[PDB]
Structure formats: structure tokens, C-alpha cells
Amino acid sequence: SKLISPAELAKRLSSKETKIFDATWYLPTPANVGKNAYDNYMKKRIPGALYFDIDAVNTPSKFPHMLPSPQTFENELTKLGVSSDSPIVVYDTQGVFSGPRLVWTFKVFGHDNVQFLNGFEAYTQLPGIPSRPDAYTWGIWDTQVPGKIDPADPPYKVTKARPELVKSFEDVLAIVEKHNGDGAKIRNEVTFIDARPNGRFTGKDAEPRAELSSGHVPGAYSIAFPEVVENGKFKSPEELKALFASKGIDGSKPIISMCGSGVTACVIDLALEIAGIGSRDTNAVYDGSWTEWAQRAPTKYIVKEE
Known part of the structure; x- marks a missing residue:
């Protein structure tokens, strides 16, 4: 958001x-x-x-x-x-x-x-807060143990729980309908992205659980981590729009993200919502990673090494 x-x-x-x-x-x-x-x-x-x-x-x-x-x-x-x-x-x-x-x-x-x-x-x-004003350079922090949290009432209740934004490992192995890469409209059907480094794709690099492979799964416009971040934060909205449109990254078809554990693949949902290349209800995310695509998937799906 x-x-x-x-x-x-x-x-x-x-x-x-x-x-x-x-x-x-x-x-x-x-x-x-x-x-x-x-x-x-x-x-x-x-x-x-x-x-x-x-x-x-x-x-x-x-x-x-x-x-x-x-x-x-x-x-x-x-x-x-x-x-x-x-x-x-x-x-x-x-x-x-x-x-x-x-x-x-x-x-x-x-x-x-x-x-x-x-x-x-x-x-x-920062210098401080309007509240806690007399305390300059403190008040930004709270250096004390977290105390008594009165619980919520009325309680949280999700109305919608939209799950189409996430995809099962079956939902990504179901590219088998067209498994010849961009030539088979993986670049037209589902614009995959991987937040893995360019070293962990376009070849082979050491995975975290370094017993399985590493690469660039079929038909995936790979956009990496520092390509939007600059030392503490995101780039301009036009900055991200240019970072994507300068590549073939364009919200014209279904789009899905990937990385280890999904813990940083959601960055490539946030930047997209920032730029607007897709739709908030569609720009889905695959919580499974290459760790799933190598440990619990076929042997031909992997991309080539050096």
C-alpha cells in the first residue's frame, strides 16, 4: 500500500x-x-x-x-x-x-x-516530536520494557481474506502448460519476477541451503534488490516507473514475485504498488521460493549455469 x-x-x-x-x-x-x-x-x-x-x-x-x-x-x-x-x-x-x-x-x-x-x-x-517537546532528541525513542497492553475490543475480524494474491507451488509448477520460456509466452502469460541477485540467476551462485541448485526459473524478468533501494529507502515513483519500463517490466499481464522465503519478495509488490504497474488485487506473490522450486519440484525447470 x-x-x-x-x-x-x-x-x-x-x-x-x-x-x-x-x-x-x-x-x-x-x-x-x-x-x-x-x-x-x-x-x-x-x-x-x-x-x-x-x-x-x-x-x-x-x-x-x-x-x-x-x-x-x-x-x-x-x-x-x-x-x-x-x-x-x-x-x-x-x-x-x-x-x-x-x-x-x-x-x-x-x-x-x-x-x-x-x-x-x-x-x-529527527530533532523530536511535537508531543514530548521539552525532551529534545528523546521522545523519538521509548527505552523501557513494553508494559500493559489492554486487549482489543471489539476484536479484529477479517471480512475478506483475499487469497488470490498468493500462489501455491502447484500454481507456479502449472507453467507446464507452456514450458519453453518466453518463447512459450511465459513473458506474455505470467510475468514472473525473482528478487534473487543477478549472481543467483543467469548462472549459478551459492544458495542459503547450499545443497540444491540456483538460477532463474522459466520466463522471469529478474529485478534485484538494490535496483530500487538507495542506502536506506525506496526511489521516486517516477524512479521505479523508469526502472521497470526501462526493462520489459510492465503491468500488462499477470505478475508474480519470488525470493527466499518470500521475506523480501514482497518488496517487489510494494515497489509495484508505488509505481502502479498492475493492480493491488492482482500483483500476486509466491511465498514458496527457489527453495521450494529446487527441493520439491522437477529437474528440468531449473535455468542453466555458466
């Missing part, structure tokens, strides 16, 4: 109708091991910000960041205070890494009134 700036957020904050969620799940590699969200979240956050357990919400799943059910979700966001028509805002301490997964998640469940914070680092360099 929309995005906003950090400056308008200070104004938007002073009334507690804007329920803020933080989402900073780090990758489970040995580098960030010992760099948690929940342990860093309860030491520095924004006044009203809340955590969402993407590791506990979607507890029953092979791929750990799978989309949970509408009734292991509603009956926890009631425990977080949000209502059906409560606007919400998102921020990630990492730049643009793990945020939009939650935005896409809310979009699945008929929740409009959702926006994402462009630049975190500029919020860090």
Missing part, C-alpha cells in the same frame, strides 16, 4: 489510532547469530511500536516464514490492540529488508489504511 515520511509520522503519532508494528527478523546465518529483534526491540523502539512474531505466528510450516492462518492471526492481533479499521505503520531497523512482508500480510486480510516508513535512518536523525 502507501508509504509515508518520518516527518509526517510525528504528527500522525500524537493520537493513538495509528498502531505501529516493528519487523526486524534477521536471517538465521552465523553472522547475525546473537543479533535478535525481540532482545533489541525491548531496548529501543518507537512510542507505541509493537512486535509481530513471524517465527511464532507461522509456527506450523516447512518454510518457516509461510503465511499463517486467519485464526492464528486475528486471535493474536486482538492481543496487540489493533482493530479492523485501525490504520497501521511499519518500520524496520534494517533498511528495507523485512518490512513489506507484514504489509503484504495485512493486504491478504482486507486491511487497507496500511503504510510503510521510507527511511528509518532519517527518523533516527
Whole structure:
């Protein structure tokens, strides 16, 4: 959905109708091991910000960041205070890494009134808030343990729960109707995109679970991560429009995204909503990854190596 700036957020904050969620799940590699969200979240956050357990919400799943059910979700966001028509805002301490997964998640469940914070680092360099004015350079943060959250009433209740925005692994293996790539109208039927790096496609690069292959699945206009981001945030709307139309990326046909766990494939839904190349009700996303397309799929689908 929309995005906003950090400056308008200070104004938007002073009334507690804007329920803020933080989402900073780090990758489970040995580098960030010992760099948690929940342990860093309860030491520095924004006044009203809340955590969402993407590791506990979607507890029953092979791929750990799978989309949970509408009734292991509603009956926890009631425990977080949000209502059906409560606007919400998102921020990630990492730049643009793990945020939009939650935005896409809310979009699945008929929740409009959702926006994402462009630049975190500029919020860090604010002077302060109109509220808490006498405290300059504090008030932006809330360095205290999260206390008592009075639960929601009336409770969250999703009216719509539109699932067509997500596609099963069958829904992507069902390109078998035409399996000769762009020559078979994969470039005309379903404009796949992969948020994997250009090194992890157009050839072969080390996957995270480095026992299976890596490449560029059939008929997929590959747009990569830094191609829209610049050191803390997204590019201009015209910037993204040019980034796509300069390629063959154009919202003329069905369009689907891909990356590891889907945790960053939703970036290539957010940027699209920003530019407008498609439709909010169509620009779907495949939560399964190359991890699914290599571990639980055929052997001929993979793209070529060097």
C-alpha cells in the first residue's frame, strides 16, 4: 500500500489510532547469530511500536516464514490492540529488508489504511516530536520494557481474506502448460519476477541451503534488490516507473514475485504498488521460493549455469 515520511509520522503519532508494528527478523546465518529483534526491540523502539512474531505466528510450516492462518492471526492481533479499521505503520531497523512482508500480510486480510516508513535512518536523525517537546532528541525513542497492553475490543475480524494474491507451488509448477520460456509466452502469460541477485540467476551462485541448485526459473524478468533501494529507502515513483519500463517490466499481464522465503519478495509488490504497474488485487506473490522450486519440484525447470 502507501508509504509515508518520518516527518509526517510525528504528527500522525500524537493520537493513538495509528498502531505501529516493528519487523526486524534477521536471517538465521552465523553472522547475525546473537543479533535478535525481540532482545533489541525491548531496548529501543518507537512510542507505541509493537512486535509481530513471524517465527511464532507461522509456527506450523516447512518454510518457516509461510503465511499463517486467519485464526492464528486475528486471535493474536486482538492481543496487540489493533482493530479492523485501525490504520497501521511499519518500520524496520534494517533498511528495507523485512518490512513489506507484514504489509503484504495485512493486504491478504482486507486491511487497507496500511503504510510503510521510507527511511528509518532519517527518523533516527529527527530533532523530536511535537508531543514530548521539552525532551529534545528523546521522545523519538521509548527505552523501557513494553508494559500493559489492554486487549482489543471489539476484536479484529477479517471480512475478506483475499487469497488470490498468493500462489501455491502447484500454481507456479502449472507453467507446464507452456514450458519453453518466453518463447512459450511465459513473458506474455505470467510475468514472473525473482528478487534473487543477478549472481543467483543467469548462472549459478551459492544458495542459503547450499545443497540444491540456483538460477532463474522459466520466463522471469529478474529485478534485484538494490535496483530500487538507495542506502536506506525506496526511489521516486517516477524512479521505479523508469526502472521497470526501462526493462520489459510492465503491468500488462499477470505478475508474480519470488525470493527466499518470500521475506523480501514482497518488496517487489510494494515497489509495484508505488509505481502502479498492475493492480493491488492482482500483483500476486509466491511465498514458496527457489527453495521450494529446487527441493520439491522437477529437474528440468531449473535455468542453466555458466
